[PDB]
Protein backbone atom coordinates (compact mmCIF):
# COMPACT_ATOMS: atom_id res chain seq x y z
CA UNK A 1 0.00 0.00 0.00
CA UNK A 2 0.77 3.56 -0.72
CA UNK A 3 1.91 5.18 2.62
CA UNK A 4 -1.19 7.51 4.01
CA UNK A 5 1.42 10.38 5.23
CA UNK A 6 4.97 11.35 3.64
CA UNK A 7 7.83 8.96 4.51
CA UNK A 8 10.17 12.44 5.80
CA UNK A 9 7.52 12.41 8.65
CA UNK A 10 8.54 8.70 9.81
CA UNK A 11 12.59 9.01 9.39
CA UNK A 12 12.83 10.16 13.22
CA UNK A 13 10.42 6.91 14.25
CA UNK A 14 11.92 4.55 12.49
CA UNK A 15 18.33 3.66 16.27
CA UNK A 16 20.20 6.31 18.07
CA UNK A 17 22.27 3.28 19.31
CA UNK A 18 24.18 3.66 15.88
CA UNK A 19 25.38 7.46 16.71
CA UNK A 20 29.34 7.82 16.78
CA UNK A 21 30.11 9.16 20.20
CA UNK A 22 33.67 10.52 19.91
CA UNK A 23 36.26 8.87 22.39
CA UNK A 24 36.09 12.00 24.56
CA UNK A 25 32.20 11.31 25.06
CA UNK A 26 32.08 7.16 25.65
CA UNK A 27 31.14 7.69 28.94
CA UNK A 28 27.64 9.44 27.75
CA UNK A 29 26.59 6.79 25.12
CA UNK A 30 23.69 5.58 27.07
CA UNK A 31 21.88 3.69 24.05
CA UNK A 32 24.70 1.58 23.28
CA UNK A 33 25.25 1.27 27.46
CA UNK A 34 21.53 -0.50 27.74
CA UNK A 35 22.58 -3.20 24.90
CA UNK A 36 21.61 -6.05 24.20
CA UNK A 37 18.27 -5.92 26.53
CA UNK A 38 17.92 -2.44 24.65
CA UNK A 39 15.11 0.09 25.85
CA UNK A 40 11.85 1.41 25.40
CA UNK A 41 12.09 4.70 23.39
CA UNK A 42 8.71 6.79 23.35
CA UNK A 43 8.02 10.13 21.67
CA UNK A 44 5.01 12.63 21.08
CA UNK A 45 5.58 14.46 17.64
CA UNK A 46 3.22 17.77 17.37
CA UNK A 47 3.16 18.80 13.84
CA UNK A 48 2.54 22.05 14.68
CA UNK A 49 -1.05 23.65 13.06
CA UNK A 50 -1.81 19.57 12.41
CA UNK A 51 -2.25 16.38 14.24
CA UNK A 52 0.55 14.11 16.45
CA UNK A 53 2.15 10.87 16.44
CA UNK A 54 2.76 9.22 19.68
CA UNK A 55 5.06 6.32 19.27
CA UNK A 56 6.54 3.70 21.30
CA UNK A 57 9.65 1.60 20.46
CA UNK A 58 11.31 -1.53 21.72
CA UNK A 59 14.89 -1.39 20.65
CA UNK A 60 16.82 -4.12 21.48
CA UNK A 61 19.33 -6.76 19.93
CA UNK A 62 17.56 -10.50 19.02
CA UNK A 63 20.67 -12.90 18.02
CA UNK A 64 23.10 -11.07 15.99
CA UNK A 65 20.26 -8.14 14.66
CA UNK A 66 19.18 -4.63 16.31
CA UNK A 67 15.41 -4.88 16.10
CA UNK A 68 13.28 -1.26 16.44
CA UNK A 69 9.28 -2.74 16.22
CA UNK A 70 7.71 0.21 16.71
CA UNK A 71 3.57 1.45 17.63
CA UNK A 72 2.78 4.43 16.09
CA UNK A 73 -0.69 6.58 16.78
CA UNK A 74 -1.56 9.41 14.89
CA UNK A 75 -4.40 11.77 15.61
CA UNK A 76 -5.93 15.25 15.38
CA UNK A 77 -4.65 15.39 11.70
CA UNK A 78 -5.88 17.52 8.82
CA UNK A 79 -7.38 15.66 6.11
CA UNK A 80 -6.39 18.22 3.64
CA UNK A 81 -3.17 19.70 6.02
CA UNK A 82 0.72 18.93 4.86
CA UNK A 83 0.56 15.46 6.21
CA UNK A 84 -2.29 13.63 4.88
CA UNK A 85 -2.40 15.66 2.14
CA UNK A 86 1.29 14.97 1.00
CA UNK A 87 2.44 18.17 0.30
CA UNK A 88 6.07 17.59 1.78
CA UNK A 89 8.98 17.56 -0.27
CA UNK A 90 11.68 14.36 -0.19
CA UNK A 91 14.76 15.53 1.86
CA UNK A 92 15.36 15.96 5.79
CA UNK A 93 17.19 18.68 6.96
CA UNK A 94 19.99 18.13 9.60
CA UNK A 95 19.15 18.07 13.44
CA UNK A 96 20.81 19.01 16.73
CA UNK A 97 18.96 16.58 19.19
CA UNK A 98 19.24 17.67 22.74
CA UNK A 99 19.96 14.85 25.49
CA UNK A 100 19.41 15.29 29.44
CA UNK A 101 19.39 12.40 32.01
CA UNK A 102 16.79 11.40 33.01
CA UNK A 103 18.00 10.34 36.52
CA UNK A 104 14.66 9.28 37.75
CA UNK A 105 14.06 6.53 35.33
CA UNK A 106 17.65 5.50 34.51
CA UNK A 107 17.54 6.77 30.96
CA UNK A 108 17.38 10.21 29.05
CA UNK A 109 14.69 12.41 27.47
CA UNK A 110 15.60 14.58 24.10
CA UNK A 111 13.92 17.60 22.40
CA UNK A 112 14.21 18.81 19.06
CA UNK A 113 12.49 20.46 16.25
CA UNK A 114 12.42 18.98 12.76
CA UNK A 115 11.36 21.54 9.41
CA UNK A 116 10.07 19.67 6.75
CA UNK A 117 9.92 21.12 3.41
CA UNK A 118 6.43 21.85 2.19
CA UNK A 119 6.17 21.87 -1.90
CA UNK A 120 5.06 25.76 -1.42
CA UNK A 121 7.85 26.54 -0.03
CA UNK A 122 6.39 26.76 3.44
CA UNK A 123 7.63 24.75 6.21
CA UNK A 124 5.75 22.22 8.55
CA UNK A 125 7.40 22.01 12.30
CA UNK A 126 7.58 18.70 14.07
CA UNK A 127 8.09 19.38 17.80
CA UNK A 128 9.58 15.93 19.24
CA UNK A 129 9.92 15.13 22.29
CA UNK A 130 11.12 11.70 23.55
CA UNK A 131 12.20 9.51 26.61
CA UNK A 132 14.44 6.79 26.73
CA UNK A 133 13.96 3.72 29.58
CA UNK A 134 16.56 1.06 29.73
CA UNK A 135 14.32 -2.39 29.76
CA UNK A 136 17.19 -4.07 31.99
CA UNK A 137 18.15 -3.98 35.29
CA UNK A 138 22.01 -3.46 34.47
CA UNK A 139 23.98 -0.54 34.81
CA UNK A 140 23.71 2.39 32.30
CA UNK A 141 25.40 5.16 31.40
CA UNK A 142 23.67 8.85 32.59
CA UNK A 143 25.17 11.25 30.21
CA UNK A 144 25.68 15.16 30.90
CA UNK A 145 23.60 17.69 28.67
CA UNK A 146 25.04 17.09 25.07
CA UNK A 147 23.62 16.86 21.33
CA UNK A 148 23.46 14.30 18.17
CA UNK A 149 24.10 16.48 15.17
CA UNK A 150 22.35 14.45 12.14
CA UNK A 151 23.09 14.35 8.09
CA UNK A 152 20.18 12.33 6.38
CA UNK A 153 19.66 11.52 2.68
CA UNK A 154 17.02 10.14 1.05
CA UNK A 155 16.21 8.21 -2.12
CA UNK A 156 14.70 5.36 -4.40
CA UNK A 157 15.74 2.16 -5.76
CA UNK A 158 14.80 2.15 -9.27
CA UNK A 159 13.66 -1.61 -8.95
CA UNK A 160 11.36 -0.95 -6.67
CA UNK A 161 7.93 -1.19 -7.71
CA UNK A 162 6.33 -0.64 -4.20
CA UNK A 163 6.34 2.29 -1.79
CA UNK A 164 9.16 2.28 -0.27
CA UNK A 165 12.32 4.78 1.15
CA UNK A 166 15.94 4.52 0.82
CA UNK A 167 17.96 6.14 3.78
CA UNK A 168 21.43 7.40 3.95
CA UNK A 169 22.32 8.47 7.85
CA UNK A 170 25.23 10.23 9.79
CA UNK A 171 25.20 11.14 13.36
CA UNK A 172 27.41 12.29 15.57
CA UNK A 173 27.38 13.24 19.17
CA UNK A 174 28.70 16.76 20.49
CA UNK A 175 28.14 19.53 23.14
CA UNK A 176 29.20 18.03 26.34
CA UNK A 177 30.87 20.84 28.92
CA UNK A 178 33.92 18.51 30.35
CA UNK A 179 34.05 19.14 34.31
CA UNK A 180 36.46 18.47 37.19
CA UNK A 181 37.19 14.71 38.01
CA UNK A 182 36.01 13.47 35.28
CA UNK A 183 34.85 0.60 26.20
CA UNK A 184 33.02 2.65 28.89
CA UNK A 185 30.29 -0.08 29.11
CA UNK A 186 29.49 -4.14 27.64
CA UNK A 187 27.61 -2.78 25.49
CA UNK A 188 29.15 0.07 23.32
CA UNK A 189 31.21 -3.57 22.40
CA UNK A 190 28.18 -4.79 20.19
CA UNK A 191 28.41 -1.87 17.90
CA UNK A 192 32.20 -1.61 17.27
CA UNK A 193 31.35 -3.50 13.72
CA UNK A 194 28.66 -3.62 10.93
CA UNK A 195 25.26 -5.01 12.45
CA UNK A 196 22.51 -5.79 10.51
CA UNK A 197 19.04 -4.15 11.07
CA UNK A 198 15.32 -4.69 11.69
CA UNK A 199 13.04 -1.96 11.69
CA UNK A 200 9.15 -3.36 12.14
CA UNK A 201 6.59 -0.02 12.73
CA UNK A 202 2.70 -0.61 12.71
CA UNK A 203 0.88 2.51 12.25
CA UNK A 204 -2.37 4.35 12.61
CA UNK A 205 -2.87 7.75 11.54
CA UNK A 206 -6.48 9.21 11.85
CA UNK A 207 -7.91 5.37 11.32
CA UNK A 208 -4.80 4.96 8.38
CA UNK A 209 -3.26 1.96 8.93
CA UNK A 210 -0.26 0.90 7.17
CA UNK A 211 2.66 -0.34 8.26
CA UNK A 212 6.51 -0.59 7.17
CA UNK A 213 9.27 -3.15 7.17
CA UNK A 214 12.79 -1.98 7.25
CA UNK A 215 16.39 -3.52 6.78
CA UNK A 216 19.78 -2.95 6.41
CA UNK A 217 22.93 -1.99 8.56
CA UNK A 218 24.88 0.36 11.10
CA UNK A 219 28.02 1.03 11.58
CA UNK A 220 28.22 3.12 15.16
CA UNK A 221 32.03 4.02 14.46
CA UNK A 222 31.41 6.13 11.95
CA UNK A 223 28.04 6.75 12.81
CA UNK A 224 26.28 5.56 9.67
CA UNK A 225 22.57 3.74 8.54
CA UNK A 226 22.36 2.30 5.35
CA UNK A 227 18.24 1.25 5.64
CA UNK A 228 15.78 0.62 2.94
CA UNK A 229 12.02 0.67 3.89
CA UNK A 230 8.99 -0.73 2.50
CA UNK A 231 5.20 -0.10 3.13
CA UNK A 232 4.07 -3.29 3.62
CA UNK A 233 0.37 -2.37 3.28
Request: overall charge negative.
Amino acid sequence: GKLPVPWPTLVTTLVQCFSRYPDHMKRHDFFKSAMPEGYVQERTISFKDDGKYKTRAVVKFEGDTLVNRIELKGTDFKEDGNILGHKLEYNFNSDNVYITADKQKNGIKANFTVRHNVEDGSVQLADHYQQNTPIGDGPVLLPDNHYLSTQTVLSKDPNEKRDHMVLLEFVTAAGITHGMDESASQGEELFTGVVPILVELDGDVNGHKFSVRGEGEGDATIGKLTLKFISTT
